[PDB]
Design a protein around this ligand. Structure first.
Ligand code: JAU
Length: 292
C-alpha cells in the first residue's frame, strides 16, 4: 500500500486559550478555544478534545486517521498538543452537530438544506472509501455544522483502514452483518448512512425509540426497518430502505448516493414535502483558509 506522507503537526499549548466547555461525556471533554500561531498574526477558532497510557494510545490513533484525510466534507485536524494526556486540536464547527441543529431549528429547515446535507455526507463518505477507510460510527451526531450550507464528518475514534473487532459500539446505526458478525465494510457505512438520513428526515428522532439494543438484532432479522418519515416521498424513502438491505453488495454505493441526492436537490419540493418550504476578532481566520 502507498506510503502515508501526511504531516503530523505538533502545537505549543502556550498558543491556545480554552474558552468554554463545548461538551462532556463518555469521551474527554471538548473545549471551544482560540489558536494564535506566534508571529503569524492570525486567530484560528479551534475545538480541543482531551480524555493514562491507555488514553494517549487511543487519541494518537485518532490523530493518525484525521491527519491522513483531506476533503472539504471531512473534519480537519490542525495538530496535537504534547500534554501529559494528549490534546487533539481540530477546527471549530460553530453550529454544533447536525443532530442538535436539526432539532433546534426544525421549524426553519427546508428540503433544499436536507438534501444538500445528504449530498455532502455522501461526498465525505465516498472520499473515506477512496482512502480505504471505514468510519464505523456514522450518525447525525458525528456530522458537524460549519455553516448551515456546509457540514463535515467528524468522529474517527472507531475508524479502521481496510474488518473484524471486539468492543462496545452503537447498535441502532449498525449493519446487521456487524451486529451478528463484527464485520465492517464501506457497505456497512452505507447502512449507517441510511439511519443518518432518517435522523435528518425526521428532524432528529431517535431510531427504534425505547427499544433495547438487545432487541434490535432480531427486529432487523425478521425484516423490520425504520418507518417512512412524514416529509418523505417514496423516492427518498426507497433510497434509505436500499441502504438497509441484507445483502451488503445490494445497497447503493456512496458515489451513487451523491448522484441521486444531487438530482433530488435540483427539485427539492418534488422529493421532500415540508409545510411552508418557501419561507476583538479582526484577525480571525477559519482553519480552512489557514494553510501551510
Ligand atoms: C440545546 N443546547 C443548546 C446549545 N446547543 C449546543 C449545541 C451543541 N454544542 C456544540 C458542540 C460543538 C460545537 N462545535 C464543535 N466544533 C468542532 C468540534 Cl470537534 C466539536 N466537537 C464536539 C463538541 C461537543 C461534543 C462532542 C464533540 P465530538 C465527540 C462530535 O467531537 N464541536 C458547537 C456546539 Cl454549540 C454546544 C451548544 C445545543 C445544546
Amino acid at each position: 500500500e502507498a506510503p502515508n506522507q501526511a504531516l503530523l503537526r505538533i502545537l505549543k499549548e502556550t498558543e491556545f486559550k480554552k474558552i468554554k466547555v463545548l461538551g462532556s461525556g463518555a469521551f474527554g471533554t471538548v473545549y471551544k478555544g482560540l489558536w494564535i500561531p506566534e508571529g503569524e498574526k492570525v486567530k484560528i477558532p479551534v475545538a480541543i478534545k482531551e480524555l493514562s497510557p491507555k488514553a494517549n494510545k487511543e487519541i494518537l490513533d485518532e490523530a493518525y486517521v484525521m491527519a491522513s484525510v483531506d476533503n472539504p466534507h471531512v473534519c480537519r485536524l490542525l495538530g496535537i498538543c504534547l500534554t501529559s494526556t494528549v490534546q487533539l486540536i481540530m477546527q471549530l464547527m460553530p453550529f454544533g452537530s447536525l443532530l442538535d441543529y436539526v432539532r433546534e431549528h426544525k421549524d426553519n429547515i427546508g428540503s433544499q438544506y436536507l438534501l444538500n446535507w445528504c449530498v455532502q455526507i455522501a461526498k465525505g463518505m465516498n472520499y473515506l472509501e477512496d482512502r480505504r477507510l471505514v468510519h464505523r460510527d456514522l450518525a447525525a451526531r458525528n456530522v458537524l455544522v460549519k455553516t448551515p450550507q456546509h457540514v463535515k464528518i467528524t468522529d474517527f475514534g472507531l475508524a479502521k483502514l481496510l474488518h473484524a473487532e471486539g468492543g462496545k459500539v452503537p447498535i441502532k446505526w449498525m449493519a446487521l452483518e456487524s451486529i451478528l458478525h463484527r464485520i465492517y465494510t464501506h457497505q456497512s457505512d452505507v447502512w449507517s448512512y441510511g439511519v443518518t438520513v432518517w435522523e435528518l428526515m425526521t428532524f432528529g428522532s431517535k431510531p427504534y425509540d425505547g427499544i433495547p439494543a438487545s432487541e434490535i438484532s432480531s427486529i432487523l432479522e425478521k425484516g423490520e426497518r425504520l418507518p417512512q418519515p412524514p416529509i418523505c416521498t417514496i423516492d427518498v424513502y426507497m433510497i434509505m430502505v436500499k441502504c438497509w438491505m441484507i445483502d451488503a453488495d445490494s445497497r447503493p454505493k456512496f458515489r451513487e448516493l451523491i448522484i441521486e441526492f444531487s438530482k433530488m436537490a435540483r427539485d427539492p419540493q418534488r422529493y421532500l414535502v415540508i409545510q411552508g418550504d418557501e419561507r476583538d476578532m479582526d484577525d480571525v481566520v477559519d482553519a480552512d483558509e489557514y494553510l501551510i
